[PDB]
């Protein structure tokens, strides 16, 4: 089942000193308080400023093995999918919270209202992005 | 025959035979890399790699683990066969191009 989705709009796409990964900063279009930071293999999924990305975190998709004859899963609905771990939660204010994910090192920080991020737990999770 | 060429390393091969390690004498990267490339194309193979214990002992270690449809020994054989067939395709193609040249 799905734990979180929102449409985000990208502010900045910083390639840092890498050339396959970029750090993305983006804000939600639906919540004024919900913002995002995410490392992306931009060689596999190019991103430019002002892009609008739909971003979904889900606990499962309805152990890993190469795709076979007629496999169907939640991944089919999206362009870019990553698997990772929630590793830190923090109080930002009386109202807002941030959760930290690592996808084999590519880091996400998702900040938002504590009711808007209610379903997120400190477990593993899939990340799904589509344009 | 020749029994000293390839042997099973029974201390890393499971009961069900869906996982196994082989030690092949007188072979380095040349065959090893080519063989793992071929084997990994087999859809029932879950894991495969080769290694060379030491540059000074002529030994090649292949590991195969399957998803349970065929045994590890099967995958080794399909891989070896696949590799042979692959060379044929190359030889034939090269021949034709030399003729047509």
């Amino acid at each position: 089942n799905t734990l979180f989705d929102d449409i985000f709009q990208v502010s900045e796409v910083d390639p840092g000193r890498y050339n396959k990964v970029c750090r993305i900063e983006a804000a939600s279009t639906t919540q004024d308080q919900c913002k995002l930071t995410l490392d992306i293999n931009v060689e596999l999924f190019p991103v430019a400023a002002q892009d609008s990305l739909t971003v979904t975190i889900a606990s499962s998709l309805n152990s890993w093995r190469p795709p076979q004859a007629g496999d169907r899963s939640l991944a089919d609905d999206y362009d870019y999918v990553m698997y990772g771990t929630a590793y830190k939660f923090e109080e930002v204010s009386k109202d807002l919270i941030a959760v930290y994910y690592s996808f084999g090192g590519l880091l996400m920080r998702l900040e938002g209202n504590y009711r808007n991020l209610n379903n997120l737990k400190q477990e593993n999770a899939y990340l799904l992005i589509r344009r | 025959p020749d029994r000293e060429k390839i042997k099973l390393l029974t201390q890393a091969t499971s009961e069900d035979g869906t996982s196994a390690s082989f030690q092949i004498v007188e072979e380095d990267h040349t065959l090893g890399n080519a063989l793992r490339y071929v084997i990994m194309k087999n859809p029932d193979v879950e894991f495969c790699g080769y290694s060379i214990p030491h540059p000074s002992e002529n030994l090649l270690n292949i590991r195969i683990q399957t998803y349970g449809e065929t045994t590890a020994v099967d995958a080794l054989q399909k891989g070896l066969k696949d590799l042979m067939d692959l060379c044929d395709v190359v030889e034939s193609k090269f021949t034709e191009k030399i003729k047509s040249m």
């Binding site: 890498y18 990964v21 999206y78 698997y83 771990t85 690592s102 084999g104 | 290694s51 683990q65």
Partner: protein, 147 residues
Amino acid sequence: PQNENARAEALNLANTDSQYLTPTSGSPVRGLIQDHISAGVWLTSKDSFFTREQYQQYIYGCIRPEDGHTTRSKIVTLPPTIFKPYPLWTGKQIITTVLLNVTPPDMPGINLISKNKIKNEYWGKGSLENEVLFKDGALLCGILDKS
């Protein structure tokens, strides 16, 4: 040495592995050097990705599971970090996979918050790669270093 008492002593008391820390100050004397440090900075870089084929090959080439470290008699692997458009593993996953195959299975994975020698500024804006994070035996952030 020429008799089993001396054998037992050389394997259990004066053996190299018994002597990781020095008695002077109680600090490490064994570690990797040169190529291996340079290699680590590269392999564990965020820019580092590997296909299924490469990932499995790095693992088997270094594990040597045909040893006394039959922690399992089957090599364990992680799922890829990127599922789609193409299955890719990161370098940090190679490390997690290594530890996963050589630490005891009946025992929780290591937990470490540490730092390395390279300042965040060197990687770019917003980097946290100076911070070394192991959670439940997995390298979640940071590169590995002489430190």
